[PDB]
Amino acid sequence: KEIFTRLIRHLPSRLVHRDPLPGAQQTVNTVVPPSLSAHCLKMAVMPEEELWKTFDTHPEGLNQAEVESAREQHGENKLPAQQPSPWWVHLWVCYRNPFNILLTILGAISYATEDLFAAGVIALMVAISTLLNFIQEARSTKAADALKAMVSNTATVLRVINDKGENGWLEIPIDQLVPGDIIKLAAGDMIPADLRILQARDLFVAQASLTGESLPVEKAATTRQPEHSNPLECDTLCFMGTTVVSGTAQAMVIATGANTWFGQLAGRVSEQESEPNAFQQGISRVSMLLIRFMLVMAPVVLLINGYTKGDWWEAALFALSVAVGLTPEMLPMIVTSTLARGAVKLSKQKVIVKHLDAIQNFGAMDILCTDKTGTLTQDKIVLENHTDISGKTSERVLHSAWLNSHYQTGLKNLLDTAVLEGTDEESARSLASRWQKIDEIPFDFERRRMSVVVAENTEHHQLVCKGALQEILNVCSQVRHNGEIVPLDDIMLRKIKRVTDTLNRQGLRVVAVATKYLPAREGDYQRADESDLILEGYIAFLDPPKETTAPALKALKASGITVKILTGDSELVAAKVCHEVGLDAGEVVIGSDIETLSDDELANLAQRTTLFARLTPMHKERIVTLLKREGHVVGFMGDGINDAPALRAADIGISVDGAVDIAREAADIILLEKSLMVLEEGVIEGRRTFANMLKYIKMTASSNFGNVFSVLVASAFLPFLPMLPLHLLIQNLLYDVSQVAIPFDNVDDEQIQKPQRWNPADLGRFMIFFGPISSIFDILTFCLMWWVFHANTPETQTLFQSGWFVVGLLSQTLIVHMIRTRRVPFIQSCASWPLMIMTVIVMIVGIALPFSPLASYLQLQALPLSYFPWLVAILAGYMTLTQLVKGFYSRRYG
Amino acid sequence: KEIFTRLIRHLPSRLVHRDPLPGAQQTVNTVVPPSLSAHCLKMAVMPEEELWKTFDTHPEGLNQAEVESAREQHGENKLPAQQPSPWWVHLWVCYRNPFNILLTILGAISYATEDLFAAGVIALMVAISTLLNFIQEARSTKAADALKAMVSNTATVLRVINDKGENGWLEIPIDQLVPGDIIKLAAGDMIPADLRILQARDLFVAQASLTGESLPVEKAATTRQPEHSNPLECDTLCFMGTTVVSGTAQAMVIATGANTWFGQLAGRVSEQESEPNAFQQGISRVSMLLIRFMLVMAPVVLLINGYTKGDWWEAALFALSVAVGLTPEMLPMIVTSTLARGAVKLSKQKVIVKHLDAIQNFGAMDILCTDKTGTLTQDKIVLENHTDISGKTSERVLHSAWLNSHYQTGLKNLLDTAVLEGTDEESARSLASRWQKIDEIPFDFERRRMSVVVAENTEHHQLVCKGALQEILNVCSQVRHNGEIVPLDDIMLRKIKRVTDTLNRQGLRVVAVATKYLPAREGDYQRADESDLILEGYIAFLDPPKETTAPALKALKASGITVKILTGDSELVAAKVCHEVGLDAGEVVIGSDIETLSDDELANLAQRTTLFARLTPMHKERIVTLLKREGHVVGFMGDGINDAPALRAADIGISVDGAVDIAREAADIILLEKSLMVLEEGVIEGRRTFANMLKYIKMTASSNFGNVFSVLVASAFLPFLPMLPLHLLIQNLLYDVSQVAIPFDNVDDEQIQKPQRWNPADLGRFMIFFGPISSIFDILTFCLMWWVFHANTPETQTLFQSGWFVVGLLSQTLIVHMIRTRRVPFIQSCASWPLMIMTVIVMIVGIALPFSPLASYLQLQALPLSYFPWLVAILAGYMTLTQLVKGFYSRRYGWQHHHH
Ligand SMILES: [Mg+2]
Ligand SMILES: [Mg+2]
Ligand SMILES: [Mg+2]
Ligand SMILES: [Mg+2]
Ligand SMILES: [Mg+2]
Ligand SMILES: [Mg+2]
């Protein structure tokens, strides 16, 4: 009957669940629909002269009023699942709960005849509960949205600043982009919307997400392709979700938001998120458990009281009032508030959480995959030697590397920075004023080199390519030895291999450089122009390991996290780095060994292997996917161009604020600095946050089930309701006010010591265990008020009901300090000061409520002074019994 | 009347002032106490057999009852200035101050005759104030003592771990040593007490502090020299305050505490600590200022009220009651409570403060002198190339270095660790089995080498020495080139020099290794045996800069601290490291350059020089001393054997928890980890603590001066006391209770952005400026109570006095939020939550006291409800006026004294 249970209010699918991330592979629904492919094809070949009039765009850019007009016309650069609802809509959906409406209707029906100010006060209590829930949810979702917007991909636009009318280059969030807006693209920038290249040089974009081709594709300002016949392959348009590999460009936004190629009929807008993740499934399962409890218990109470006291319209109200404590509507408030408090406290620790549910995984992660550069090493190399094949230092190698590092337009490397810094000013200036760039062949993993074609004159050009030693040697036919040029024979090949292996075993990364002279040519150089090269030498450099890497790794191992290194570098350098930081590399697995293994074989091998070397991005993604095989939660750390699938293939993806745009787009956690200590501290605090959330749900559900059980067992014998439903609503409201400060509780270090596994079925066991314990003392209080205080007849019922009230509210508020931890309270474990203060305040308010002037309005009678010793005895006995009985639940259940 | 000043109570000279360190050297105030000297000469040559009976010591050690017996008989291993006084003595000295005594005496005199229960309650208020002060001082002194005991030099002793009699080797604090205790000594351990060596293995100790000789000397189990004639030069006794350079030993304690040669006569006991440091001088100046204010003001109030009301025994009591607000007895409570709260907080930042006054220096530091190794770079090296002179990798060089590193007993080095770890297990065990140790020639700065003599047989011995390249080359005559021993000509010398200079310019430190073969002999090896050596090669290793050194240096510069590098390494490696970490080396000055310079020349040069290289410890000490030339507070950070003179020479000395014993003993601050980020954060926190202390002192002084001024100007016109002195005592007590939370206040980041400078004369200007400003409103309240509320006669004086009381306490309590910060409160700068809570609580108590049942007992009368709007108006006007007037004080003099 789950199809009929629509009482659950799901959290918005931006606080939980991931973003679409337009990387949903090559599969497309009928390859886009008509009037979209045709529109893109028309836009590709549309002359640039009439392009300005179509979008009301000018070369100066867009001013304010124009950008707001365009945003109103075309919407906002977002997806329909990212716009928050208005606060009044949220308040209305919080009030239209199928339980609040029923409570108000039953209050009216019971008290429409000859007794007002009762239905009104019940409705007012319902409104106060709704307002409290709405306030918590709204504050927490606002904080979550602010934290998500803190780390957002930005685009560089013209716009208008200096209202006297001066252009500029503003970095604005990609959601503010409107159609017909001018942006500029450099290396590492993801495409923010469907573009139209106005003017570009050496612009290469990686489109493996959309067209499925790994090699980057050159994108020119004006089309040079004979026929298009396809919108995805035209060289003048750039689609959202792809990254810029190298070169520079300036383009115009043509589509925006849902109108983008991916955002319409190519993903995102195709159906919805039919499959929920682990966190959503767990929340739904807990909500279903609570609904089952209510639907099994409340009708029984209704039937019993209707058969006994013959007031059905009041018995139903009373049963609903006791059931409301077990409502599922507590779940959105609890989850949102606790996870948002955890996310804010993480943001104070240089950890930004993009969606709330990731916190669960960030506490459940037991395997952490990453690269050795930046996380284990310092990413800045200290020592570097530019030598030829004979070991002697050579200035020609340094100058060739300087050319290749200066005229390249790709992302800045550590070698590129060190080469540009280690070259003196005079020689650098001479080379810059003597050589000029012509062409650039970017970096791809099929050949693992990078080429730059420069020239000092108009007669001949020089192609200078640098890359890993083996890849360079594969395409070198001559070597410059002793100032002469000699064929690269096998003897020199093996000598170079041995010397470079010896260097690699010292932790020195070796990058070879080759140059070739070609006649002047008026055509674009291709990857086929990297043959018969002249090997100048190599550069050996040391990226030293961080001082805070070994303690961080030890702390991560203490927390239960297994660290695995997925690197594309050499096996020897990675092994040396792992040994220098205390990591046990064991036997290494290179990427060429897993290309023949089956999925089962590689999944079994990756569990024992610690270091994986010479991996392509596909290998990293496959390893991350197969490491989730045995119920493990895998976290992948990466900040590269090609880390988009792996970051998404992991159970949790972690990136850095200084990453490329797609790495931040595909990540779930963003670290403000690339450190493992920050990651470990964040994992600890997220474990505390998720433990607090579980504790809050657990205690609330258990106490409310105890109250419902007490009502169910001890209402048939009484000739009146044990507690008036108004008193129940006040009790629940004050308990919720007390519980507001549970997100701020303290968590034992023994609870967050190991990765957290969340079983929603444990809540049922906890409720069953800790409900009857409260019910026993509830029945004891009933007997005390029946016999000791002689509240026998209905006429003197207000003494009885109020007599339970101060017991119902106080114990429910005190039991929190007993069942929160697993140890003995107040000596080995103490609740946080905000929780202590809230408990004391709520206890004081509950004690003083029967004595307050409002007690006459709330149908509460004052209490004789002889009742307080009995109340203290009951509370102390309840606390002692639960403290002595916790051990049985600990042993038999957990 | 400087001699007449017995009112000032100084803090114990352990929270402030540095403990005596045994660096006296050429200092022999008492020269030689013959009685003491005769004892050593007898102890040195006394046979080991009868040594056990003299000190009641057994070879297995001492059990419990014996160790407490020896401690009771011989005292504890401490100096007389380090024993805390018992708590009851502290309470008595807190109660017997000449102001708590005169107050009670005058209360008895005034209220004995037919007006009892008034002198009693006055004495009760005085006792409550005394108890509050004593509790604060005792708690903070206990916290400071615990912090000092956290980082204390320890000694390894036998003792008795088990009830059955099993012996152990316990690390006990050096103060727990009793005479006749058996300890063991290794490299880097300082001598904790006078010792008699029971057994030794190549034990070399540095006695440069006592005898003034830099070269370490050999200590043997039995004497090997013909005549001693001098207790300090006997080769079988070790004296406290010296360090063990190398070797191992087991010795017996023969003297302890004051009885130690250093402790008695030669040092410490002679004379006393006549000269105080800067913090003690500032505290004394503040106390003298407060005493002068009281002595100027209180007699005038006494005379005025005696001539007006004709009750001298009440007028003097009243004047004393208003004056007590300006007592110096708050200074021990103010200083101890505020600083300790900072120090404890610093203990949570891995910064342990050994004595409280160091905090003032630690926030006032503007020049920081450190070494490049450990602070700027990691102490673990990543790359190393063991090659010969031709550049080819050589296994023989690595094996010789492994022998030298394995068989040396000195302090472990980074190169030693790298060489021990970089040799494979099979070859390492083969070398260990094949070679056995014979002798060791330790490291000293005159030659800057270290040698180990081993042997594979009984025919010949091999001497393996290692050290800096030039020092090894000076004593090398041949070189092993291409497997042949060839004479080391000048061409090879120049080639090696240029190759190693190229290596050094890359940040690589080069350590040369030489070996020699000698015929077997029986005598010990000397420094003259390092000649005609054979240079095997050198080891070039990379010590990478720390990841966090550049941000820490940027933060240190942003905080106003100028970092200077004093290193004994080569100038090329140090310059490369400085460039890597972002520091500007500028022009490097080597140690040999400054030897011929004068004091003025070197002092002028050190101010514009960032990196000093090739420095002997004497050069480091001289540079640190001369860097204090013009109002500069110098901090020296070192963790070496020879860094004690440089640590004690600086205005503040910072060391590391893992340092050698003498480095920790000579330091003022101990960092739990060797990091510059920790140092910068601790400096910021100490600046906050000192700002809070100064703030605490200036506010209590200004408000109480304002109250005294109001009384002086007003009480002449009135026909009765403006406030009963009982109410004044209550007001002062409640204000102190409110101010208890000041140590926990917040400090603006503007007050901690520069090295602080403390001027005791600024307090007088602050008091003069901010007293009348609150006397204005006291006179306004007097007029309000006189005319609006018709308290015109003594019969209704109780309404008048209480009318001032609520104004007196709340304003004094509220004004704190106005004058704690230079900015406008509650919008830019807000007080800390404990301070706000205490302010609210004290205001509530002051309002509710006249309405309480105790009001009749305290001679307080209930206030009409029409008085509250006037009170609120007065408080708001006072706050607004002081806020609008703070600007004038800021412009004319500046809110704080700062800059370098
Ligand atoms: Mg960008
Ligand atoms: Mg091109
Ligand atoms: Mg209950
Ligand atoms: Mg020791
Ligand atoms: Mg010897
Ligand atoms: Mg005043």
Give a concise summary.
Chain A: This is Magnesium-transporting ATPase, P-type 1. Chain A has 894 residues and is of the alpha/beta class.
So, the CATH homologous superfamily of the largest domain in chain A? Answer: Calcium-transporting ATPase, transmembrane domain
List the strand order in the largest sheet of chain A. Answer: 8-23-22-21-9-18-20-19
Count up the domains of chain A.
4
Structural class given helices, strands, pairing of chain A?
A: alpha/beta
Report on the biggest sheet of chain A. 8 strands, mixed
Which CATH C-level class of the largest domain in chain A is it?
Answer: Mainly Alpha
How big is the Rg of chain A?
34 Å
Alpha carbon gap, first and last residue of chain A: 31 Å
The hetero molecules present are:
magnesium ion
Q: What's the assembly state of these chains?
A: homodimer
- Helix content percent band of chain A: 40-55%
CATH architecture of the largest domain in chain A: Up-down Bundle
Count of distinct strands of chain A: 23
Number of helices of chain A: 29
Biggest interface, which chains?
A-B, 14 and 14 residues
Catalytic activity (chain A): Mg(2+)(out) + ATP + H2O = Mg(2+)(in) + ADP + phosphate + H(+)
Function (chain A): Mediates magnesium influx to the cytosol.
Extracellular side (chain A): 114, 307-315, 714-722, 789-797, 850-864
Main location (chain A): membrane
Protein traits:
8-stranded mixed β-sheet; magnesium; 894 residues; homodimer; elongated; Calcium-transporting ATPase, transmembrane domain; dimer; membrane protein; 23 strands; alpha/beta; transport; Rossmann fold; binds magnesium ion; cryo-EM; 14% strand; Calcium-transporting ATPase, cytoplasmic transduction domain A
